Design a protein around this ligand. Structure first.
Ligand SMILES: O=C(O)CNC(=O)C(=O)O
Ligand code: NI
Ligand SMILES: [Zn+2]
Length: 346
């Protein structure tokens, strides 16, 4: 993947079954270089028999998304609304006020999104603690991926909502996720359970730094008040701005039944097309350990999520533990390099 473009994969069920092993595989094919990959699961795989029974799930903290800005640069402000069922949510999503406009091609819809972003604030059913996987789904169950991320809770008892536990997202048209990498620069997995698509922008990890340097110049206030101000997940930048300032990026549209994977230090943003439901969580491979150790974290206390790297460095990098602890570990990350578990396929 020398061009670092977004790759899509179509595994059989035999290949699908072992999750960490398929991640090692797609990295053996260069997937991680894009920062984002699509995995279309096998036809016979479903995480849930039906979604008919969720009209009464509470969205405890729906968020109205107020967007201020102009000329491709915007900041999103969150207003917490009162708790709402998914049934109340969907009525509002599909009503005339909030529903998806009529469009021909996706490029038309994308245009309307960037034109109308600051108008008619939508509500995002974001960050809902839960899963829509049935108990017995063993393949790619976001509730239990069985990656080395599990060592956090194993060792310490610590669970971090949405990081080592699942989050559900009920979208409506024009609801947004701002530019970010994952907390601790982890991987993420996103499954779109049902509804209208979710569109994604991705910057390759090898160019992530150029993106942060540009964002610092575009929002200099924010930069002086926080090292990692993009971790607040309030910063929207249009693809035309990225392209005007020479940031490589790719785009892709996720459809119901599809998984997206994001990779360590892969900056992504996007928006929902209409009423939908996504489930996501973070995960890790051995390659992530170095990203974790090196992650530039929020210094102003808006983003509190911080994982102790000690257990990972002790277990998987015992040579460098005393050096690392003396603060002498000057390893440079090579973003093109697949995870060690990928040697099997290389
Ligand atoms: O769906 C959303 O709001 C955003 N999802 C992600 O950023 C992810 O899965 O990493
Ligand atoms: Ni993300
Ligand atoms: Zn901060």
């Amino acid at each position: 993947n020398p061009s670092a473009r977004i790759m899509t994969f179509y595994p059989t069920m035999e290949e699908f079954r072992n999750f960490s092993r398929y991640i090692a595989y797609i990295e053996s094919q260069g997937a991680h270089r894009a920062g984002l990959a699509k995995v279309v699961p096998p036809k016979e795989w479903k995480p849930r028999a039906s979604y008919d029974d969720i009209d009464d799930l509470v969205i405890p903290a729906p968020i109205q998304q107020l967007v201020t800005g102009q000329s491709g640069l915007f900041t999103q402000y969150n207003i917490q609304k009162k708790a709402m069922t998914v049934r109340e949510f969907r009525k509002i999503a599909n009503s005339d006020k909030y529903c998806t406009p009529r469009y021909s091609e996706f490029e038309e819809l994308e245009r309307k999104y960037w034109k109308n972003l600051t108008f008619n604030p939508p509500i995002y059913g974001a960050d809902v603690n839960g899963t829509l996987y049935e108990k017995h789904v063993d393949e790619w169950n976001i509730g239990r991926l069985r990656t080395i991320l599990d060592l956090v809770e194993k060792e310490s008892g610590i669970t971090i909502e949405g990081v080592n536990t699942p989050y559900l997202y009920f979208g409506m048209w024009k609801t947004s996720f701002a530019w970010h990498t994952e907390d601790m620069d982890l991987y993420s997995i996103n499954y779109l359970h049902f509804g209208e698509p979710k569109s994604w922008y991705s910057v390759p990890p090898e160019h992530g730094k150029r993106l942060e340097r540009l964002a610092k110049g575009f929002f200099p206030g924010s930069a002086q008040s926080c090292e990692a101000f993009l971790r607040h997940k309030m910063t929207l930048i249009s693809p035309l701005m990225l392209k005007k300032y020479g940031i490589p990026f790719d785009k892709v549209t996720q459809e119901a039944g599809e998984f997206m994977i994001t990779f360590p230090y892969g900056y992504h943003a996007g928006f929902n097309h209409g009423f939908n439901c996504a489930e996501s969580t973070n995960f890790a491979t051995r390659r992530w350990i170095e990203y974790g150790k090196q992650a530039v974290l929020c210094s102003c206390r808006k983003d509190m999520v911080k994982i102790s790297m000690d257990v990972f460095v002790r277990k998987f990098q015992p040579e460098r533990y005393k050096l690392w602890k003396a603060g002498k570990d000057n390893t440079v990350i090579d973003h093109t390099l697949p995870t060690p578990e990928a040697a099997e396929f290389l």
